Design an enzyme around this catalytic site. Structure first.
Site, mmCIF file in Angstrom:
data_model
loop_
_atom_site.group_PDB
_atom_site.id
_atom_site.type_symbol
_atom_site.label_atom_id
_atom_site.label_comp_id
_atom_site.label_asym_id
_atom_site.label_seq_id
_atom_site.Cartn_x
_atom_site.Cartn_y
_atom_site.Cartn_z
ATOM 1 N N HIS A 65 1.548 -1.379 -11.343
ATOM 2 C CA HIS A 65 1.261 -2.133 -10.341
ATOM 3 C C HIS A 65 0.045 -3.240 -10.613
ATOM 4 C CE1 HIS A 65 -1.901 -2.131 -6.863
ATOM 5 N NE2 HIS A 65 -0.934 -2.320 -6.402
ATOM 6 N N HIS A 112 -6.056 -10.645 -7.510
ATOM 7 C CA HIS A 112 -5.961 -10.124 -6.250
ATOM 8 C C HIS A 112 -6.537 -10.712 -5.185
ATOM 9 C CE1 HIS A 112 -6.582 -5.679 -4.038
ATOM 10 N NE2 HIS A 112 -5.475 -6.544 -3.738
HETATM 11 CA CA LIG Z 1 0.162 -6.686 -5.344
#
Ligand SMILES: [Ca+2]
Length: 1001
Positions: free
Chosen positions: A297, A342
């Site tokens: 992830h 992110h």
């Molecule tokens: Ca992601």
């Protein structure tokens, strides 16, 4: 050969991103310690790396050191990078040689030097380790060892010297001509120490004088169940390869009983079955939907989800572990080329083009099997065109551009898709306010950095981001009782508040501190000149002790920060009066209110109980007691109301029912954006925001949340720049006053087409369904059989919930047992579930594909049968006998214990722990204390055997040291070594348990 050219050395140019100017150094290989050393001068070695820790030797100028350096004038063919380390983020030694000749000499010479180290016997690694130790004191490359220097080393190698007599009585016995010990005098000391400390294990073995060729063959055949040991010539080889003694090599080999103990603790005697170290291509011809696929992830990240560094090295590291499903979060770059980070966070940005290259160079080095790129798309159509072009151009034939078979009704096999990169991306049919803010502490009178975010009109903020000289210091109290100290520290509402006091009627001291609204006391005695905190935490000075526990944690994750002085009590008392109209507690959140309700660790009171001690909890019948930690006998430990983990009678509680579930579902904490990292929550609907005209407390840029509701406290935040303050001001004021896909990329999606279709019926093999952790857990809860059946033809991806901002992981066991293929985990996190992932994907030669067992594809496959219908295929019994070379965590000597557990979705905390050995990490023994524990295993192919070594600290708290986690499939019987790994599942040098294991089918 060239090994002599490397042992002599070579002058080269070192590059560090940490140092701003390249440094010329002699680079050499010390064969005796198996290190690559780099020195400025001949007398002392500036820096070293263990050859054992090398993961990759990468030619060229491809490293963070190189790309961050000013120039690098040396040629590509003279430049290379040693990537090494014990963590997810590897250290880099980037080198430029004078010539292409030397560079090529090193890449060849290091490769063979590594292999030699990997293939080396345990006794060769012990001599290297003993060599490292005597080098470590003064770094001269020493030849002998002082009595006073051995006494300085023993505590560093996690052994407490019981008495001065013990060393001298030894010294004599070994042969202490003087206080000096030569290398082989020291070598002999280790062997005597290890044997004398662990001798008692032998009471389980023969009454012969030594262990002869025949005795050992029987041991391998009957007790170890090694059926190759029939071939008696193989058994004599193992002995000799272990021993390595020319004079005893003659005729028939025998081990001395102390050499036999060493073999039992050694790699050679590992519990791990090696046949699972190779791929089995007979398990690689099933459809892709039948495989567990090693899945990462937000692969780009090396740390938290908020402000940690993105790196292409994260993609490289994962891919070279055999990770087969990696994630690219693709955002519009400045120059029409996508960036990866992110979104909306302070996580550093890296270039899509560097990640694509990195994937190409590293996808298929350690594993040949297909790599899946999970693309989260935020880019424009034009930036999507760059991606579609860049994939085709850089990947070429590696890029899957058409289906393997045109008339297919199921997915192809891993075999069929070897050296293929598969694009998962939305296919065409035929703005959160957050960042770092400073917060003010009136107690400390200091600003700290916190990560803050606004979700649904609520600003959530994190914890902060990082000769008797004590007699003058105002945190020392000459004439203070234990009771006063508790009251003084109960006046100051801060974890890490501390004072040091002399103990009443004694020339010794105590540290008393506040943790979680409760005062604790720590005894500080004297060893001549030294100060000893608890048992073995040695300090020259109480100032040195206070300095250390300012930088390092003392109690759990609490550090010393708030020295409780008379001036502080005076100041805070007045300020508390001035600020009386508001309750400051309301901005902070309770530490339990962020801690989740444990899945199955809750009990219900059968009777009223009155506490016969302050230790014991008191409660009424029907009371639900949460987070219960179960030990043997009468008393368990658990949380009720405000109190945490206090003692209660085990026979006064019973199991909860479904009828109690609804009550626990109400008690489920409200998630906030910072999850575990959340320290306080502010309701911006109940505040006005004002900018301080001239800032406050020496910050220029300060905004203040002024309370609307009586009792609510005002909160001061600061920024580095006025422009930050403005964005925060306007974001808060706007609350306090109140789908296009590029055809070129779409065409690259052959399989793993994302779908929604609401629910799990009619699985398309070209389609993938993705579920956040939360959605995944409700499917498992309500529809487990739908997921299983979907997963036979269709693919599933699961990823952590958005709140896991600390990069924590989630239980994958239940998802795996419902056939879920891509359970995406934070590979950068050293926790239980990454450890499980590394265990599973140690099978089938680290390809990152593990065929789901045939059992999971029959009509009668039930992961969750009823208690009465539980079918038992195997019993596993385990005894933890001892350990060698446990790591030293902090300043004190390890007090270790081992927790053994069977891990899986069929097992509710199926564990047992050993007793504690005091002040000995080097050579602990547990054999005499407990009998075997027996585990019932329902299916061996669906479960893991997990060993975790903890230290028991002075507060009786468990701290992680090491682990070993194995599919039960790959566990061998008998007296087996368990090679111990750190939190990242990297090997700890010479660290191992010795266990006995019996499997009965
Ligand atoms: Ca992601």
């Amino acid at each position: 050969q060239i090994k002599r050219a490397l042992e002599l050395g070579t002058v080269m140019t070192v590059f560090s991103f940490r140092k701003s100017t390249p440094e010329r150094r002699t680079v050499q290989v010390i064969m005796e310690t198996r290190q690559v050393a780099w020195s400025k001068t001949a007398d002392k070695i500036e820096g070293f790396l263990d050859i054992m820790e090398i993961k990759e030797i990468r030619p060229g100028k491809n490293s963070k050191d190189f790309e961050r350096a000013k120039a690098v004038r040396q040629k590509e063919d003279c430049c290379f990078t040693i990537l090494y380390g014990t963590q997810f983020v590897l250290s880099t030694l980037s080198l430029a040689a004078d010539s292409k000749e030397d560079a090529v000499n090193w890449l060849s010479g290091l490769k063979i030097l590594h292999q030699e180290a990997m293939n080396a016997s345990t006794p060769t690694i012990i001599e290297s380790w003993l060599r490292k130790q005597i080098y470590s004191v003064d770094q001269t490359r020493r030849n002998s060892i002082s009595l006073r220097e051995l006494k300085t080393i023993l505590p560093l190698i996690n052994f407490k010297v019981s008495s001065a007599k013990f060393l001298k009585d030894k010294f004599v016995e070994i042969g202490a001509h003087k206080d000096e010990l030569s290398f082989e005098q020291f070598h002999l000391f280790y062997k005597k120490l290890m044997f004398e400390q662990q001798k008692s294990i032998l009471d389980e073995f023969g009454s012969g004088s030594a262990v002869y060729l025949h005795d050992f063959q029987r041991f391998l055949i009957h007790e170890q169940q090694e059926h190759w040991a029939q071939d008696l010539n193989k058994v004599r080889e193992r002995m000799t390869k272990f021993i390595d003694d020319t004079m005893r090599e003659t005729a028939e080999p025998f081990l001395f009983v102390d050499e036999f103990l060493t073999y039992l603790f050694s790699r050679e005697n590992s519990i791990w079955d090696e046949k699972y170290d190779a791929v089995d291509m007979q398990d690689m011809n099933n459809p892709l939907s039948h495989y567990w696929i090693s899945s990462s992830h937000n692969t780009y990240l090396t740390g938290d989800q908020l402000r940690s560094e993105s790196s292409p090295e994260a993609y490289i590291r994962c891919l070279r572990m055999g990770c087969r499903c990696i994630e690219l979060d693709c955002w519009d770059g400045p120059d029409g080329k996508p960036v990866i980070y992110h979104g909306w966070t302070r996580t550093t940005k890296i270039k899509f083009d560097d990640v694509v290259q990195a994937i190409k160079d590293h996808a298929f080095v350690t594993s040949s099997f297909p790599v899946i790129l999970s693309i989260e798309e935020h880019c424009s159509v034009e930036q999507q065109r760059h991606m579609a072009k860049a994939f085709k151009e850089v990947f070429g034939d590696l890029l899957l551009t058409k289906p393997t078979e045109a008339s297919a009704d199921q997915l192809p096999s891993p075999s069929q898709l070897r050296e293929k990169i598969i694009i998962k991306h939305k296919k065409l049919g035929p703005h959160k306010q957050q960042g770092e803010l400073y917060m003010w502490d009136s107690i400390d009178q200091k600003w700290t950095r916190h990560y803050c975010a606004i979700a649904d009109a609520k600003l959530s903020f994190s914890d902060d981001i990082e000769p008797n000289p004590h007699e003058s210091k105002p945190w020392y109290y000459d004439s203070l009782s234990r009771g006063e100290a508790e009251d003084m520290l109960m006046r100051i509402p801060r974890d890490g508040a501390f004072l040091i006091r002399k103990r009443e009627g004694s020339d010794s001291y105590a540290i008393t501190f506040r943790a979680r609204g409760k005062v604790k006391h720590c005894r500080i005695n004297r060893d001549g000149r030294h100060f000893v905190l608890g048992t073995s935490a040695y300090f020259e000075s109480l100032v040195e002790l206070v300095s250390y526990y300012e930088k390092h944690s003392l109690y759990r994750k609490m550090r010393l920060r708030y020295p409780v002085t008379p001036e502080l009590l005076e100041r805070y008392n007045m300020e508390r009066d001035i600020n009386s109209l508001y309750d400051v507690s309301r901005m902070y959140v309770d530490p339990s209110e962020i801690n989740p309700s444990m899945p199955q660790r809750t009990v219900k009171a059968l009777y009223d109980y009155k506490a016969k001690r302050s230790d014991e909890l008191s409660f009424c019948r029907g009371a639900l007691i949460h987070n219960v930690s179960k030990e043997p006998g009468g008393w368990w430990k658990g949380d009720y109301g405000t109190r945490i983990q206090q003692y209660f009678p085990s026979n006064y509680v019973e199991d909860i029912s479904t009828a109690d579930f609804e009550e626990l579902e109400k008690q489920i904490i409200e998630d906030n954006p910072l999850g575990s990292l959340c320290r306080g929550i502010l309701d911006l609907n109940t505040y006005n925001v004002v900018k301080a005209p001239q800032g406050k407390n020496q910050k220029s840029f300060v905004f203040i949340l002024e309370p609307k509701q009586q009792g609510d406290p005002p909160v001061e935040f600061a920024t580095d720049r006025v422009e930050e303050l403005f964005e925060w001001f306007q974001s808060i004021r706007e609350i306090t006053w109140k789908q296009s896909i590029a055809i070129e990329l779409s065409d690259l999606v052959v399989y793993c087409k994302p779908t929604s279709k609401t629910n799990l019926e009619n699985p398309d093999f070209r389609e993938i369904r993705s579920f956040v952790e939360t959605k995944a857990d409700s499917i498992i809860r309500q529809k487990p059989v739908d997921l299983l059946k979907y997963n036979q033809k269709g693919l599933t991806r699961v990823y952590p919930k958005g709140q896991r901002v600390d990069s924590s992981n989630y239980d994958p066991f239940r998802l795996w047992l419902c056939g879920s293929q891509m359970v995406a985990l934070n590979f950068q996190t050293a926790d239980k579930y990454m450890q499980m992932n590394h265990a599973l994907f140690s099978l089938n030669g680290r390809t990152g594909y593990v065929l789901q067992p045939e059992s999971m594809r029959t009509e009668k496959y039930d992961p969750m049968p009823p208690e009465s219908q539980r079918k038992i295929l195997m019993t596993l019994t385990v005894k933890v006998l001892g350990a060698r070379h446990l790591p030293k965590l902090g300043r004190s000597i390890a007090c270790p214990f081992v927790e053994v557990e069977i891990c899986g979705a069929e097992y509710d905390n199926n564990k047992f722990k050993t007793t504690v050995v005091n002040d000995n990490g080097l050579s602990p023994i547990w054999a005499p204390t407990q009998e075997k524990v027996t585990f019932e295993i329902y299916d061996p192919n669906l479960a893991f055997l997990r060993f975790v070594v903890y230290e028991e600290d002075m507060f009786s708290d468990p701290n992680f040291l090491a682990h070993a986690t194995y599919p039960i499939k790959a566990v061998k019987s008998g007296f087996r070594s368990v090679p111990l790994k750190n939190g990242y599942s990297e090997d700890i040098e010479l660290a191992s348990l010795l266990v006995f294991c019996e499997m009965r089918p």
